[PDB]
Every structure is written in structure tokens, then in C-alpha cells.
């Protein structure tokens, strides 16, 4: 669909602008809660605990059927929060996330068809990679901020280090197996911007109403990454 | 071409372990298949490591008609055709080549291609595939990697192969989206070459009892 | 353009270890090349990750016309052409990009692209490439992964690079399909920058003796 006044060049510039905006937010935040939610309504207490404990960011995974409604609820409850959608496998999901109010999408792997879709609809994508060939594919599409996933199972910090060496332009968001015990090892790598983590918002705590624990874990990581 | 994947998925889920066979002399598939079948494991993935694989599939299908027979190391459509004509009902590739997958669709045989990371999984899903080989399983990160793939991709079902042994197979089978694992240990070429039929029978009975107690 | 891969493979096979050089000051390549050659390793893969790489290739080719010189970190055809014009014998890439491979064909320079899993191997094989860099070797699963790849893909010849040291190189070289490994330890930035020519010479003599006794 064509918007009056918007040519292909403007769409490209817009996508670049959105990439820069997201990059700067990630670099400041350093840790992104990765949220898998059963009941959409649970996103409200969870967003409140995150925000009031100093972590105004959430990536809601489309692995749950509740994801789109959760994004819509959180967006309304927490206007200032950085909200992303994860597990985005195609352009239809990307669009649904955008409509609901997300300002970036993340995918577990790299699919150029998903990337082209996001570049067209004007939502930043940070796609998952785990080897040099996939990094090269992403670079060729003009992306530089990539998710590194699954981080620990793909070789952890030694893989990150091996991986960023040849590619000076990339910035990574390692996700998968990140905990308070290893997050600083990742963040020590200059080309790592932020890590994704589930432990501070773990489904086991959410489903069992353990809001005080979520709060404690959130405060702990916020202090740890930006002391 | 009507896909037999629902049938294959069910057979794999029942078997839990698929012998991955590298045969030197095709004739050797006959006693090997007899030992596998009579010890409770009526399945075989015959790898295309040499021309002898084609004859082996043909001999095995004649000797053990109800055996689940796949062909492995299938790198192109020509080999997929050779396997189909020999009597295999599915092919397996170590990695994912969409040109091979397309060729298999055209010639009409099911393929279970190998993947080992999220991007390759997404490539397969985009071509309509959901049953995938996870290879090489241990060298790619093992159960930790398997859990990372099945997690985001609820539709996939995996056949981990590579470094699977009786000491680690239970951990893989404990993951619901794992259908079965491929294993060479009970059909190791050394055992076949040396005619260690009693030992092959023992390893086969032992694994069948282990996975299907 | 007739490919020199035959010659390249023979040279790699003879050398067994290839210095992977990230150079800060192009002029450093002259003494470094001399020390490497005079101590038995007349080869260098100079990475384009360094701004000095093109000038270093030119200087080294003039100073050591018989040196095997590879240009590393080649991500597109523009760089490949720059490498060819500078005097490189071949180009190396950390991963596999069909666009780079196509450009190298056009330009007329051999490429040894990087791979680390079966799907990427199949992609390379489908473009007619058989000599491949296995990178990053240790972080991708090391010798267990190498064994997993060379098994189903008998035609490939590998150059493992990434985490290789005198303590682990023999384990790679013991695999028949491994031609040579890339290593940075004998040309480490710290040594080259600080002009530790005697230490570079020692390390070079030591590995040459180790792999070619
Ligand atoms: Cl994701
Ligand atoms: Cl992980
Ligand atoms: Cl296979
Ligand atoms: Cl393995
Ligand atoms: Cl390289
Ligand atoms: Cl890949
Ligand atoms: Cl490494």
C-alpha cells in the first residue's frame, strides 16, 4: 500500500532511522526481558513490575497464542516501555506485531523473506544468527544489529568472539542460556549491545504469582548491568 | 505425489532408534537386516557412501519387505531417484539443500533433511517440511541445542543423529518433539565386516529394551 | 581463467599450517614475510579486516614473489578484485556467500570460502567448490564437527581455522581430509607490533618441525 508523500527512498530512510533508535535503546538497557505468556492479562502485572523496578523493556514471544493481545495491553499500560515481539517467522506476524504497538521484531533465525517484509512495513528487525555465513547474509541486506541465538548452545562467548572478529560492523544481542552468572562475560565484548534473558520474568514465577521475586530479580539485574 | 510423512512419523515414533548403515558389500545387508528385524528393530537407513547402497536397498526390500527402509547421504535428486527405484520410502540428507528438496518433491519421494541451527529450520519450514534430521547432534551442541530449536518452532519434529549412543539417547528421547534418533553403534561397519552377528544382535536387543521398556 | 586450486591444495598440503596475519602497519609485512619464509613457512593469509591488508599484500608479493599469499576476510567482489590486483594467489572468506563466489569466478581468482555446518558444505559443493575453510573451528565443535562433515562429504578438503594452537593442531591434521590449519599464534599482533622477530622465528621453526618431522 502506497502512502501519499512516501517513495521507496523515504521507506528506506525510515527503516534506517528505526534501526538507529532501537540500537541506541538496546545499548542503554543492556538486558531485554524475553516473555512467554500463557494469559494475555498477565502482561499487565508483569509490565508494571518491570517498569517500577527500572527495566522498561519487554520482548513478547509469538510462541504464545496470547502474544498479540499482550502487546496491545502492555502498549496501553506502559506507553514509555520499549516493546518488541519475538519468534517472528514471517511478515504477517511482523505486521500483527507492528499494528499492536511493538517497535521492533526479533526472529530466532534469519529469513530474508521476513527481513524484506519488515523493511517494507517499516518495523526494525533484529534477526537471529549463529555462524559466519548467516552473518554475511544479514550484512548483505544492510543489517548490522543481529541476535545471536542460541547463545550458549552455539558456543557461547568463544563463538561470539570468533564471530565478531571478522565482522567489525556487527553488533550482537546474545540470547539463549544467559543468566546473571554469565551476562557480564557477554557484555564485556565490545560489539555486544545487550542480552536477552527469561530468568527475571520466568513463566514459573509468572504463573505462580511470584511478583515479589520477579521484582527482586529485575532490580538485581538492572543494578548489575548499569551499576 | 502424496506424502507418506504421517506414516513415517508414526513408524519413527514407535521405533525410537534408526540404524544408520554404511555397508561395504551389498550382500551383507541380508544377514544384517535379518538380525535387526528378529531382534525387534525393523528399520534401516542405508547411507549412499558407495554404489553398493543401491543394491543393498534392493536386496533388503526383497528380504525384509515390511522393513522401514530409508536412504541416507542423499545430496541430489539423481540419488533420491536411485533410492526410490531401489525401494526406499524416504530419503535423508546430512544438511538442507532446497534444490534437493524440490527435486524430491518432483520425483515423488519424501525427504527428511538435516538441520543444525534456527536459520536452516526456518528454511525448511518455508518449504513445508516439519520432520527434520538434527545433525551432527552432539557436535552441534547436543540436547541444549535441541531444546533451543524445538522451543521456538512448535511444529518441528526431530531425528537427532551424530554421536548418539546408549549412554545419551534417553536424554534426547525425553524431548517430546524428538521422534527417534539415528545410531550407527549397533550396526558399526567393523562389526559387520567381522561377522560379529551375535554382538549386533545383543546391541539391538539391548537398545530396543532400553527405549521401549 | 584456469583455476589454480590443484596447485593451491598441494601447497596447503605441504605447509600444513598457514599464518593468518592481521597487520597494523603494512610495512611490518616485509620483515614478517622474511622471518616466516626463512624459518620454513613461506605462506601468509592476510586479513582484510585490517586496513593495511591491500598494501601489505602488494609489498609482500614484491618482496617474496614465490610466497603463497591468500587474502582473508573477503566479503564481496570489490574486495576480491582489490586482492587479485594486489597480488594474492587466492581469497578466503569467513562464511559462504554465493555472490562472492560468483564474483571470484568473474574476476578470475580462486576462493576458499568458510563453512561450519552440513548445509553450508552442501551449498559450497553445489557451486563446485571442494576446498573449504572450516571456521571458527574450535567454537563450532572442533575435531568432532570436522569428523562429522568429512564423513558424509568425501570430496571436501578442509582448512580448519579458529582456536588452532600447537596443542591441538595434530588432532586436526590426523584427519585425512584436513589439508592445513590456519593459525595466528606465530604471527600474533603483540609479537609483530613489538618486533619480536626472534620469538616469531622460534615459534615458526617449532611448528614446522612439529607438523613436518
Ligand atoms: Cl525470537
Ligand atoms: Cl543456549
Ligand atoms: Cl544423511
Ligand atoms: Cl556429533
Ligand atoms: Cl577469512
Ligand atoms: Cl547455516
Ligand atoms: Cl574458534
UniProtKB/TrEMBL annotation, chains B, C:
Q: What is its EC number?
A: 4.1.3.16
This protein's UniProt keywords: Lyase
Keyword field contains Lyase: yes
Name this polypeptide is given: Keto-hydroxyglutarate-aldolase/keto-deoxy-phosphogluconate aldolase
Question: Which species?
Answer: Vibrionales bacterium (strain SWAT-3)
Amino acid at each position: 500500500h502506497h502512502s501519499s508523500g512516501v517513495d521507496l527512498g523515504t521507506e528506506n530512510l525510515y527503516f534506517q532511522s528505526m534501526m538507529s533508535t532501537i540500537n541506541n535503546q538496546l545499548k542503554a538497557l543492556k538486558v531485554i526481558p524475553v516473555i512467554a505468556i500463557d494469559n494475555a492479562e498477565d502482561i499487565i502485572p508483569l509490565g508494571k513490575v518491570l517498569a517500577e523496578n527500572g527495566l522498561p523493556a519487554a520482548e513478547i514471544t509469538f510462541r504464545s497464542d496470547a502474544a498479540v493481545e499482550a502487546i496491545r495491553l502492555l502498549r496501553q499500560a506502559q506507553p514509555e516501555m520499549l516493546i518488541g515481539a519475538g519468534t517472528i517467522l514471517n511478515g504477517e506476524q511482523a505486521l500483527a506485531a507492528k499494528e499492536a504497538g511493538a517497535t521492533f521484531v526479533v526472529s530466532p533465525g534469519f529469513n530474508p523473506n521476513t527481513v524484506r517484509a519488515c523493511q517494507e512495513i517499516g518495523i526494525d528487525i533484529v534477526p537471529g544468527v549463529n555462524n559466519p555465513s548467516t552473518v554475511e547474509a544479514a550484512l548483505e541486506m544492510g543489517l548490522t544489529t543481529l541476535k545471536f541465538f542460541p547463545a550458549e548452545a552455539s558456543g557461547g562467548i568463544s563463538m561470539v568472539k570468533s564471530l565478531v572478529g571478522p565482522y567489525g560492523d556487527i553488533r550482537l544481542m546474545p540470547t539463549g542460556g544467559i543468566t546473571p552468572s554469565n551476562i557480564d562475560n557477554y557484555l564485556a565484548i565490545p560489539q555486544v549491545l545487550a542480552c536477552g534473558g527469561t530468568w527475571m520474568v520466568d513463566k514459573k514465577l509468572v504463573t505462580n504469582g511470584e511478583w515479589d521475586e520477579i521484582a527482586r530479580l529485575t532490580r538485581e539485574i538492572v543494578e548489575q548491568v548499569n551499576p
